[PDB]
Amino acid sequence: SKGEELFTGVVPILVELDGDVNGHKFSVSGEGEGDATYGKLTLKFICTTGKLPVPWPTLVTTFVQCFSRYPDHMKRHDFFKSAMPEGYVQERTIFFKDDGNYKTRAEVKFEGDTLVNRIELKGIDFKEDGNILGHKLEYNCNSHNVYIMADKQKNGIKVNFKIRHNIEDGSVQLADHYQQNTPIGDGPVLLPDNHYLSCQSALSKDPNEKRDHMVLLEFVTAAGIT
């Protein structure tokens, strides 16, 4: 496939986000590389505006599913790579149970040999003392499945999943994700049969980094079809 060939090797990744959560404005710049052959992503994010006003884990899902490893027999269901290099628009509403919500719009595409994820994020209705603005979430990520369905209406896909963020008191903060992706270009894309992506994310810190940041190692494999 067209885009498929663009991911056979290691690809540099750039992530740029501008956010506003309850009036707290911030920006994050991320850099790294992905190797879809192994569904592997390695990235480092820096809050360039100072301190991040929300917990880093809450932004992980927002910060390029085109790096998911699609088994050879499922290659025809890989919408993400099929939309490349022109890219796709990814939109989400993330509902934090008993708290606010993030609405995001991103464009994922190639700029030269670099895969770029440019995001605008808007958060509202958060509680000042809640788990998000109150920073009560653990610095880690649980593993989750991402459910994908074709969205013929918009020549794209509809995606849904639940993310459970660990709260420091041992509880969990649910973040219900509703997502839509549509091609930026007019080229043909692969509309998939229902399947899911099995995801795992490991968060860490760079011991030599004094700026507010997050180091992320992620592995994603598509499954659900034999």
Could you state, in order of their start, the residue ranges of all structural domains in the chain? 1-226
CB 13, CB 30: distance < 8 Å: yes
In Å, what resolution does this model reach? 1.6
User: Count of alpha carbons within 13 Å of 33, Cβ hemisphere only?
Assistant: 9
CB 142, CB 58: distance < 8 Å: no
Question: Phi and psi dihedrals of 88, rounded to 5?
Answer: -145, 160
If phi > 0 it is left, if psi is from -120 to 50 it is alpha, else beta; for residue 22 that is left
CA angle 92, 133, 209 (to 5 degrees): 90
How was this entry determined? X-ray
Supply the Cα-derived Rg of the chain in whole angstroms: 17
CA angle 133, 134, 136 (to 5 degrees): 120
Handedness of CA 211, 217, 9, 145 (dihedral sign): negative
How many other CB atoms sit within 10 Å of the CB of residue 116?
Answer: 18
User: Count of alpha carbons within 13 Å of 175, Cβ hemisphere only?
Assistant: 29
How many other CB atoms sit within 10 Å of the CB of residue 143?
Answer: 11
Measuring CA to CA, which residue among 67, 78, 51, 54 is closest to residue 15?
67
Distance CA 86, CA 75 (A): 19
What 153-162 contacts at long range (C-beta under 8 Å, 24+ apart), as own/partner pairs, is 154/180, 154/182, 155/182, 155/183, 155/189, 155/191, 156/79, 156/88, 156/180, 156/181, 156/182, 156/183, 156/189, 156/191, 157/79, 157/181, 157/191, 157/192
Chain interruptions in the chain, by residue before each (C–N > 2.5 Å): 63
Distance CA 54, CA 214 (A): 13
Measuring CA to CA, which residue among 177, 178, 182 is closest to residue 151?
182
Contacts of 178 (CB under 8 A, 6+ apart): 92, 93, 94, 95, 159, 160
224: three-class secondary structure by DSSP: coil
If phi > 0 it is left, if psi is from -120 to 50 it is alpha, else beta; for residue 159 that is beta
Strand partners, 35: 40
Question: Phi and psi dihedrals of 59, rounded to 5?
Answer: -105, -10
CA angle 107, 143, 37 (to 5 degrees): 60
The domain made up of 1-226 has a fold known as Green Fluorescent Protein (2.40.155)
Q: Where are the beta strands (DSSP E) in the chain?
A: 11-21, 24-35, 40-47, 88-96, 101-111, 114-124, 144-151, 156-166, 172-183, 195-204, 213-223
